[PDB]
């Protein structure tokens, strides 16, 4: 029963989280700094996210411990302590959304990617996102707060001085802000947009892969057609099919040998020399073994690497949602069901701890899923 015992557990757990969030995310920043292979726009958003998680350990967690005491404070000071974590969560959402878009450009418009997506533009986007996060997270300080309706019975019972309140989250931060503005508009909508981006990434990868396969099968089918010695009409028609595919494959080294060899055979076939056109087409089986098989396999593995990277990013976004959703959902109960008894205090604190735990997990996901990070972590730890 004595409040200090339960508080001791919660504070201890918070501090353990803070240590881990600081240490793992410092390692992330260190790895990007040290390894030029990791210096790319995608990972500038990774660093912005790690910076947000570092600040969860250095500031948000000390603020959360502080506000759990209900200490007397000027209400607007209390608001800052209460809301600063919403800045960090918002910055995390922007960084996650940026990463998802980045991976979409990369898989969907790779020709243009490095042209569109530069480190200087990325740095500007990150600055903007941080500014917007401050404005979203600290909106209660602009007047959308309960500071005009203080709980004077709590204030008095705690001994607070004139004009102070007991600094408690749900006393000062309006739930309509938390539910409608923060959760629905600022969190859930970005998360649904993120989900839509990832679904478009995986559909674009699957489509490009199937086209690689279709274009390859077309080459091989049209060859068997030619060997089914029909008319010059046939050979011609199969070679035209092959040439088109060959450009879809190229347009999308030895493609010149390939298209030349097709053109050579097309001339023979357009001149009614079926057997020499057939003989001419058989040289294709060699250019295909020596060049086109190789281009296909490399294109396949480049794709898979990008699917792999996109899944890693999606995992991080999904873990952000898992960790933060319980708090938002509880707030919905508090707001929408005044007839419901309030979620109990142990559960509130469990949900807070769970949200903070999100700031620990990304460095593990990078180490398990991204060899360049893992390898750089290892060398740093030495
Ligand atoms: C660069 C970093 C380390 C700066 C951190 C500054 C933090 C700790 C400062 C900045 C603003 C400060 C708050 C400003 C106003 C008040 C109201 C007062 O009645 C109680 C203290 C309280 C709630 C302060 C607590 C400490 C505070 C949150
Ligand atoms: C440490 C370097 C990098 C930055 C400087 C941070 C300084 C200015 C911060 C760190 C901790 C802060 C203090 C934390 C707590 C309180 C109690 C509050 O009732 C009044 C403000 C006061 C006294 C803060 C004043 C500003 C403060 C001293
Ligand atoms: C892990 C993620 C994906 C889902 C988590 C769902 C959690 C947050 C849900 C599942 C069951 C829910 C509880 C069901 C019943 C009540 C009683 C009500 O008087 C207050 C809210 C409270 C206590 C709910 C709080 C939120 C709750 C704990
Ligand atoms: N509802 C809520 N409460 C708290 N702390 C107060 C927990 C509490 C709730 C009731 C009470 O009588 C005493 C303490 N922090 C909170 N943080 C958040 C939050 C951040 C992001 C989404 O929700 N919600 N939230
Ligand atoms: C009292 C709270 C305010 C004082 C504490 C410091 C506030 C820090 C605010 C914003 C930090 C933004 C850092 C973003 C790092 C970007 C990483 C990158 O360059 O890719
Ligand atoms: C961030 C690096 C700089 C060092 C941080 C400064 C250290 C401040 C840490 C804790 C502040 C403790 C405030 C509580 C004491 C006041 C209690 C009271 O008498 O009412
Ligand atoms: C290397 C140091 C790492 C830890 C730094 C922690 C910085 C402390 C940040 C916020 C503490 C805020 C506590 C406010 C106490 C208010 C007390 C009062 O108003 O009476
Ligand atoms: C590391 C720092 C972790 C905790 C930081 C600050 C805790 C200070 C709590 C506020 C002191 C006043 C409490 C009270 O008077 O009831
Ligand atoms: C860190 C930079 C500035 C810290 C300012 C702290 C102001 C605390 C005032 C609290 C009060 O007087 O009620
Ligand atoms: Na985060």
Curated annotation (Swiss-Prot):
The keyword Transit peptide does not apply. Glycans are attached at residue 155. It is found in: Cell membrane. The keyword Protein transport does not apply. Residues 3-8, 68-78, 145-174, 337-344 are extracellular. Adenosine binds at residues 170, 331, 355-356. One of its GO terms (biological process) is membrane depolarization. The chain crosses the membrane at residues 9-33, 44-67, 79-101, 122-144, 175-199, 313-336, 345-368. Ubiquitinated. Deubiquitinated by USP4; leading to stabilization and expression at the cell surface. It is a multi-pass membrane protein. One of its GO terms (cellular component) is presynaptic membrane. One of its GO terms (molecular function) is G protein-coupled adenosine receptor activity. Receptor for adenosine. The activity of this receptor is mediated by G proteins which activate adenylyl cyclase. The cytoplasmic C-terminal domain is necessary for targeting the non-ubiquitinated form of this protein to the cell surface. Interacts (via cytoplasmic C-terminal domain) with USP4; the interaction is direct. May interact with DRD4. Interacts with NECAB2. Interacts (via cytoplasmic C-terminal domain) with GAS2L2; interaction enhances receptor-mediated adenylyl cyclase activity. Belongs to the G-protein coupled receptor 1 family. This is Adenosine receptor A2a. It comes from Homo sapiens (Human). The chain holds residues 2 to 304 of 412 of the full protein.
């Amino acid at each position: 029963a004595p409040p200090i015992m339960g508080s001791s557990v919660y504070i201890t757990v918070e501090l353990a989280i803070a240590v881990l969030a600081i240490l793992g995310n410092v390692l992330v920043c260190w790895a990007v700094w040290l390894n030029s292979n990791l210096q790319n726009v995608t990972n500038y958003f990774v660093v912005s996210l790690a910076a947000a998680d570092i600040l969860v350990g250095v500031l948000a967690i000390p603020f959360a411990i502080t506000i759990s005491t209900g200490f007397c404070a000027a209400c607007h000071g209390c608001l800052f302590i209460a809301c600063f974590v919403l800045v960090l969560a918002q910055s995390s959402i922007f960084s996650l959304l940026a990463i998802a878009i980045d991976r979409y450009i990369a898989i969907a418009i790779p020709l243009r990617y490095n042209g569109l997506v530069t480190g200087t533009r990325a740095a500007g986007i990150i600055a903007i996102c941080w500014v917007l996060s401050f404005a979203i997270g600290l909106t209660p300080m602009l007047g959308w707060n309960n500071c005009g309706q203080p709980k004077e019975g709590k204030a008095h019972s705690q001994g607070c001085g004139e004009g102070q309140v007991a600094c408690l989250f749900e006393d000062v931060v309006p739930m309509n802000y938390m539910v409608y503005f923060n959760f629905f508009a600022c969190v859930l909508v970005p998360l649904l947009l993120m989900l839509g981006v990832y679904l478009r990434i995986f559909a674009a990868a699957r489509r490009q892969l199937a086209d690689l396969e279709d274009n390859w099968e077309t080459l091989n089918d049209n060859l068997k057609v030619i060997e089914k010695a029909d008319n010059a009409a046939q050979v011609k028609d199969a070679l035209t099919k092959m040439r088109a595919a060959a450009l879809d494959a190229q347009k999308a080294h030895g493609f010149d040998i390939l298209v030349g060899q097709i053109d050579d055979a097309l001339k023979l076939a357009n001149e009614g020399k079926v057997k020499e056109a057939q003989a001419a087409a058989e040289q294709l089986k060699t250019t295909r073994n020596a060049y086109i098989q190789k281009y296909l396999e490399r294109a396949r593995s480049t794709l898979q690497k990008e699917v792999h990277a996109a899944k890693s990013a999606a995992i991080i976004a999904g873990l952000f949602a898992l960790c933060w959703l319980p708090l938002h959902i509880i707030n919905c109960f508090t707001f929408f069901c005044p007839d419901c008894s309030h979620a109990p205090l142990w559960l509130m604190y469990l949900a807070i701890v769970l949200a903070h735990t999100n700031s620990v997990v990304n460095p593990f996901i990078y180490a398990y899923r991204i060899r360049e990070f893992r390898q750089t972590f290892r060398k740093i730890i030495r």
